[PDB]
Design a protein around this ligand. Structure first.
Ligand SMILES: [Cl-]
Ligand SMILES: [Cl-]
Length: 161
């Protein structure tokens, strides 16, 4: 198990434009296209991302390429973020996967909000962190997935997957 296998399980694979859990146009393995309610806006973003006129449909290969780019982007984002980088670097490899999973789903606009959780993670107070992480809109809106990620932070094992 690794971040690709983990996110494949959490995000699924869909080859035509669909709406994610927040109602946003998405494709492939959790590739967010746009927050716009206009489907034409999403189709444009898709063509731009893939570099051809897709008409809302892609291949598995294209889906895996976007997935690779998106994972790479999530990691680089963490490493460029002065708040996230020291916590990330303090973690073991399995817990680093949980961290990338979060950023992949949430982006990093929630950094200030998860300040207390992040401190507990860097302190390696795993049970306290896990309890704190569940006190979130994130947990309440996607509890099954959040439970899997939190368990991964708590244990440093792949037991939830
Ligand atoms: Cl792209
Ligand atoms: Cl708490």
């Amino acid at each position: 198990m690794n971040i690709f296998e983990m996110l494949r399980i959490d995000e699924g694979l869909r080859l035509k434009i669909y709406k994610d859990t927040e109602g946003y146009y998405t494709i492939g393995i959790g590739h967010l296209l746009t927050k716009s309610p206009d489907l034409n806006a999403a189709k444009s973003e898709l063509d731009k991302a893939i570099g051809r006129n897709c008409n809302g449909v892609i291949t598995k290969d294209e889906a895996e390429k976007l997935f690779n780019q998106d994972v790479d982007a999530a990691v680089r984002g963490i490493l460029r973020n002065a708040k996230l980088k020291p916590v990330y670097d303090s973690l073991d490899a399995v817990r680093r996967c949980a961290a990338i999973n979060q950023v992949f789903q949430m982006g990093e606009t929630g950094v200030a909000g998860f300040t207390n959780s992040l401190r507990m993670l860097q302190q390696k107070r795993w049970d306290e962190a896990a309890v704190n992480l569940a006190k979130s809109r994130w947990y309440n809106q996607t509890p099954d997935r959040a439970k899997r990620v939190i368990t991964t932070f708590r244990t440093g094992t792949w037991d939830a997957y």
